[PDB]
């Protein structure tokens, strides 16, 4: 119940990478090459926060 515990933490952290966080898409290269630079900064700022 320690090891599992720590494992769950790491798993949950990596599962925050596939989350949109209110932006357009989780994968960052899409936002890097779909929109304009100010709009890209807005959506990337949502993902960074």
């Amino acid at each position: 119940d320690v090891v599992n515990q720590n494992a769950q933490a790491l798993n949950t952290l990596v599962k925050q990478l596939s989350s949109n966080f209110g932006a357009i898409s989780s994968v960052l290269n899409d936002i890097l090459s779909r929109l304009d630079k100010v709009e890209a900064e807005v959506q990337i700022d949502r993902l960074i926060t």
Binding site: N29, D30, S33, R34
Partner: protein, 49 residues
């Protein structure tokens, strides 16, 4: 009478079917390379599986 064609496209929401319009490159294994596939991009070592 003019044969007015109004051409439009849409990438950037889906994987693509009209591809290979130009030339590809060759395989490099066992090295940190930058791979570009049809839909998938990224950077990594392309070991043999």
């Amino acid at each position: 009478p003019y044969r007015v064609v109004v051409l439009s496209f849409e990438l950037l929401h889906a994987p693509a079917t009209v591809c290979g319009p130009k030339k590809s490159t060759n395989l490099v294994k066992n090295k940190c390379v930058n791979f570009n596939f049809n839909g998938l991009t990224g950077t990594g070592v392309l070991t043999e599986s």
